[PDB]
Write a protein that binds this ligand. Structure first.
Ligand SMILES: O=C[C@H](O)CO
Ligand SMILES: O=C[C@H](O)CO
Ligand SMILES: O=C[C@H](O)CO
Ligand SMILES: [Co+2]
Ligand SMILES: [Co+2]
Ligand SMILES: [Co+2]
Ligand SMILES: [Co+2]
Ligand SMILES: [Co+2]
Ligand SMILES: [Co+2]
Lengths: 251, 251, 251, 251, 251, 251
């Protein structure tokens, strides 16, 4: 139950990821063999729930690619449920301030370090109580990544970076650009400056910067600035664009 | 992605609907061909979730009947999820006051007009980014219908009618009668007076009144008073009553 | 595990049925409460399989209405699987002669009376070995109903009626009229005479005649002639026709 | 729709239960025949949702074992949904004080006794309006069991016991031991003393004590002290431990 | 219910296709918007069944791309079921001779032209009896495509082409190369000559040649020779190869 | 893609198995961690199909326990489909003679050694063409186990054992005892002698004997005689018997 993604971040090894929105355990397996370091199972903007997360975790399990799950909100009940099905790395949307970051962290930890509900006999997370001393080992292998998605969050970043248990800070360029007045479109100097400044500041605190970016040149730029978990494409996009380009080549 | 239901309301064309609680994409398709103007996929009182809403939207899509979705609550996270799977007309339960109406509206609109989270690449709503300029076009095709279901809501109706983006106000007779002391049974003069007064007042503000009513005579009465989205039956009821009547005719 | 439908036919008590093509455990339960004596779960012309038959059986179980299952063909493997999930009454399509009727019967019976494969530890049929002496008791509670759907089958009816274990013979008017040259339209005197004569011949042989007929006056006619299992309507038709009629009343 | 579990508690007949976390309508049926008084469908620590609760209720229905459902949280919207699919006995997690206990109760009752939303035509709970006078009969057959899981809840127990409509108070030993500093492991004198004291105090108020305990000797001890709903094992545990022991016997 | 794919082949308009093996109604919709003329829902080499074919048909329905379904075998029972959920164009594998081609055709046609079983009240194919004169109109809109996959089938091609109702003949290069001794590797001159000669012979008989080929230059070659239904890629391959290429660009 | 179960049988290392009839990917994972050498996914007597076999394969994949799949019949089409989702070890029921054994073997092998259809781009079996030279490597890692379940099959055992590609012969005591006139009750000396003699004859031919037996002392006896794949219990039985015993201890 060692969290190898968490360990790679702490060691400064950049992790290249693919976003999964196809909400299918079958395509998840197909993509798990493609060579990524991590895969993001999106519970916020794709039609997933705890049960489909579970089947995608099962599909991914024998492969080297490490799963990360995005809950629909920073909701301790939903987080509890995701952790019991075996989630160990969470990408939490819309974290606006340090109090919210701390709540995300505490939702992942058993008392006294947090408020995670205890239900080990029933949980894939403990392999139904086969993992010895699960209750004592679990807190240390949880990896909490928080998303900053607004001007308010950018302003609070220093305080967020000070929250123990926040392992990574992810910048969401679509939401951030929208909040900044550019309608979800991030290729604007002001948006890029905000993104790049944050990446530097995050890395300077010893924490991992993350981002999703489908432009490969920008992905490399962010990596050069110190980003450590970078998602470089989206399954639905890869499929739709490849199919459309193919059809067009035949008229 | 033009919302034709929204446009019909704005033009004063009454829309006759059927409520869908069978929670099945197969019966949804069968009913989509029956000639209704709109179909209500009930996420509040039927066993639906975001995934079953999606498959019912897919089933309904080639037919002329327009889908409307009822979330389980006025919850911005659930609303975000429903919109990303392609919902454009929402019937929001238990809206008690103008602040709650405004929150329902803002949950449907991208910044700065609202707080809708951006996730277009992943969404059926944008057809996975095939709809050009989706982010700029989407807000205008969202149709927000709010339910008034209590004496408190009836008292706040004038203020609710003043909220921009509230396109329609729906009266729920079962909940309202229960709140008024008649245990969910609306055939009482006091309940009828409250319902009919509201319909007039709603229509007078230039907004669309709506209601569900399985009594056909009352449905016509409400339409005569200016109601514009009237659901005139429920799939589960139509099926159960037809089957029971058939069995009884054979002993 | 007593087969009450089988016992009712044997006692000459007419059983009034409803056909289930909605392929849903949810609507199956709703309909199980409507007062029918039997419900036909259609695996031939509706999108069912062994798994959906199982869930419909579970839904129907606490109600008085008795389930009957139609496999897609007279296939001993498919019959084996349906019996293991708990099916005790089978309506077998396209039985053309006595050899085929005997094959259907033998598929339902353990050796030496048949070729039914043994796997009771695993099966709902034995309640996972909780029913005592299941292997000894099962054969006697199987009820095999065979469909005659062609002129060839009608010619062979006398021989079919002589097969031990054939408890009932069902006439399919749609298939039969098509075979006779009337394109699935059974309201033609030559077709009605063939159906009436069969019903009489079946009843005179001391076996149960069955049929499906959505015309309530024809149903009553066939019951008058001695039909013992008569399905009087179809769920999809009930729902579609009720919905269409309702929409049309509002224009 | 009489709630026989509720009645057994009120009469002081101890009810022996099994916890269901396999989240399957198939194993639920298999276990429903095993001889327990009650079965707990866990929506908090197993991958269930309203739809899987529904299918497990359907599977259990013909058996004598009575279902109890644990929602993921004391959430009135989730409770509304569970009740409409037919849940009549709820085990509510993390009830910390009398206000929260009262909210749990009110979520189960129609106005004016509570805030349960009205949606009877659509609901399995009313058998789609077949149960006569459902709206007037339902409140009295709801059984609310609240979990005390923290030192704070133990301190508030007297006040919780004073809340009308709280039928039972359940002690969760894993969560309680964790909150008390023993990492989810309850075999410590301080934890046992707290548990046994609570059971006595609960029973003294005329309300039903409950607990889950897989140690059979402790289960008997708690029953001797007056516990009335005692779950004595967990499906996932029974299966995993039996399978592991079997494999080990063969090397 | 006009079969537009069938009409296009008959008019000699080349139709460009994409193979669907992801077995998902969700990715089917995403791909239905990509601009292909036809989409092949593979029930032979992907984990589909009648139920998943149905949901993919529903997903594809509002788009211009036309569905074609491959059953697992030339099995009249399976064909009956696929046609009842709405399939109008079938790609039948392993058709070895004229008798087998005639069997495939007859499985799709109502008596007297075939043995298709009648069950239109129940079926999506007739929109649950809403399509007027369905029984009379259906035969003419069925399009049967047969696969020649062996040397034996190639030898019998002239006779196969003479079967009335065979609208198209599809060459499977993987199976054919394997049968000819090149282990599913069709890039060998003896295999390419057999494929080219077949394409020409098919087109000269006034029927439509088809093929699947992921090499875009070979596809263009076969179109130049007269192939009329050409699948140019496979969803799983598009996705896997795009993902793998992306991961590799980041090392 | 090395078949480790096949290699263990060939090396004479006894493999201890558990039968899986719960038809759930969730319980399959729980059981995959219990320490068995092999797990039998039963498609003949449990409600499985190709789709549920796939998800169970995915669940089991990261564990050491090796999957074996039983199709419902010796059907080459069903075998093709099971192999494409990744099945490498098959337990084929009701193999009565050498011709049928050879048919089972040939169904698993690509031409010229068999008739397995080629569709590797699409299949999990090749990891969607990611396994290099899959077409060349696959045949050698298929393991075919045939069931002898009748007196006729026992008579033909010598010839069956002479079929190249038959790696193991499994005796089904339930079916065999039924065929011999002991109604699925194999605890009769004539049945035990037939089973013992078969085990010895199989092992002496240099092939692997197998059996299912829930009596642990008989299992140990058959292992002593040379049986190489022995299933020692069934999931549904383990669960049902553990639950029933537990309930009974509390009365
Ligand atoms: O659980 C059954 C669903 O609600 C209807 O498909
Ligand atoms: O509803 C379709 C799912 O989201 C994809 O399997
Ligand atoms: O995801 C697997 C379910 O939780 C058990 O049926
Ligand atoms: Co975002
Ligand atoms: Co309401
Ligand atoms: Co018929
Ligand atoms: Co607890
Ligand atoms: Co082929
Ligand atoms: Co057997």
């Amino acid at each position: 139950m060692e969290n190898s993604f968490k360990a790679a971040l702490k060691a400064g090894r950049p992790q290249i990821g693919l976003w999964l929105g196809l909400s299918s355990s079958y395509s998840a397996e197909l993509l798990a063999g493609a060579g990524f370091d991590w895969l993001l199972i999106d519970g916020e903007h794709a039609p997933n729930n705890v049960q489909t997360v579970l089947t995608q975790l099962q599909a991914i399990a024998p492969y080297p690619s490490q799963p990360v799950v995005r809950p629909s909100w920073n909701d301790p009940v939903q987080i509890k449920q995701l952790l019991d099905v075996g989630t160990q790395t969470l990408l939490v949307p819309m974290v606006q301030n340090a109090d919210e970051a701390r709540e995300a962290v505490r939702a992942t930890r058993y008392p006294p370090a947090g408020i995670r509900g205890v239900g080990s006999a029933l949980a894939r997370a403990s392999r139904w109580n086969r993992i010895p001393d699960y209750l004592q080992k679990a807190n240390d292998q949880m990896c909490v990544l928080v998303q900053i998605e607004t001007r308010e969050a950018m302003k609070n970043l220093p305080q967020i970076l000070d929250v123990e248990g926040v392992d990574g800070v992810f910048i969401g360029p679509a939401d951030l650009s929208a909040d900044m007045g550019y309608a979800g479109n991030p290729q604007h100097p002001e948006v890029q400056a905000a993104i790049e400044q944050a990446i530097v500041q995050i890395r300077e605190s010893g924490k991992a910067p993350g981002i999703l970016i489908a432009n490969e040149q920008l992905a490399k730029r962010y990596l050069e600035l110190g980003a450590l978990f970078v998602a470089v494409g989206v399954d639905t996009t890869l499929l739709a664009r490849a199919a459309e380009a193919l059809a067009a080549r035949f008229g």
